[PDB]
């Protein structure tokens, strides 16, 4: 006899490690809640949610789409709307790509503009902690960030078409270098874009900025790049003549990770090129 009740549940019953239960607790959560329900998004974005953590990526994509029916315009209350995190999710699953994952990449990056200049109007009135609203900014802040940058990724693979293209991208990495300064990823965003720009040099002092706000910091530390950003950035390393980098990059990742197959490779190719370099200087 409580609709937000059982959703609190399953939203407990995911981060309790029992998928299964949580997608029970949550399906039938929505069907107390009706099609037309006033939380009906919230209920079918964490289906979508626990769908994705399962592994149905064809239930999943539908739920999120389902969520965004009910509220297209992404102005509803996250509480009964779900946020845009619906329009970010069915960006990434989208199977097509392209300009089809651009639009909904868009669709959420707005709506986490507006979320967080609200937050920031919030601050102004200042309730009793503010402490608690910084940091939902900060978070705010990075899942936008996060999505300028997968924007560009797609822009410097699927499309490349238009010279529409290329000036998204400049201005992409605009916003993302003011918004996410300390996040290493924007900064090989920036490098990885002034490569195709084949603005070289550029790409060297982005990549040397990245390196150098995580290659201290332990792999205790949160601020680490998750592996597969930093086989990307090896990946730019060795494109840009930065073999010597690359080298202490891939020496981390084999220590974490002593099943990785590109790494090796990569490790490999990149001592390879080095050595095709000290082969120039005598001859």
Partial sequence: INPKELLDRATTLLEEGDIET?????????????????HAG????????????????DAARNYYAAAVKVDED?????????????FLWLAQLSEEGGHDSVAWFERGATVLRAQIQSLMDSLEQRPLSRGQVEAAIADKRRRLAETLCAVVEVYMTDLSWEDDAEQR?????????????????TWQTVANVRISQERTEEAREA??????????????????????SRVSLVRLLIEVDMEEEALEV??????????????????GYARYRLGEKEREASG
């Fill in 42 to 57: 919230a209920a079918l974005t964490l289906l979508g949610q626990i769908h994705v953590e399962l592994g149905d990526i």
């Fill in 22 to 38: 949580a997608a029970k607790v949550a399906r039938t959560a929505y069907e107390h809640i009706g099609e037309n329900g006033r």
């Fill in 169 to 185: 991208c400049e201005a992409l990495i605009t916003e993302a270098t003011m918004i996410a300064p300390e996040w290493p990823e």
């Fill in 74 to 86: 992404g102005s509803l209350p996250e509480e009964l709307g779900g946020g845009p995190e619906k």
């Fill in 250 to 267: 891939t020496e981390r990742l084999i220590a974490e990770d002593d099943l990785s197959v590109e790494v090796w490779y990569l490790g």
């Fill in 207 to 228: 990549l040397r900025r990245s390196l150098g706000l995580w290659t201290h910091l332990p792999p205790e530390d949160p601020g680490v790049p998750p592996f597969p």
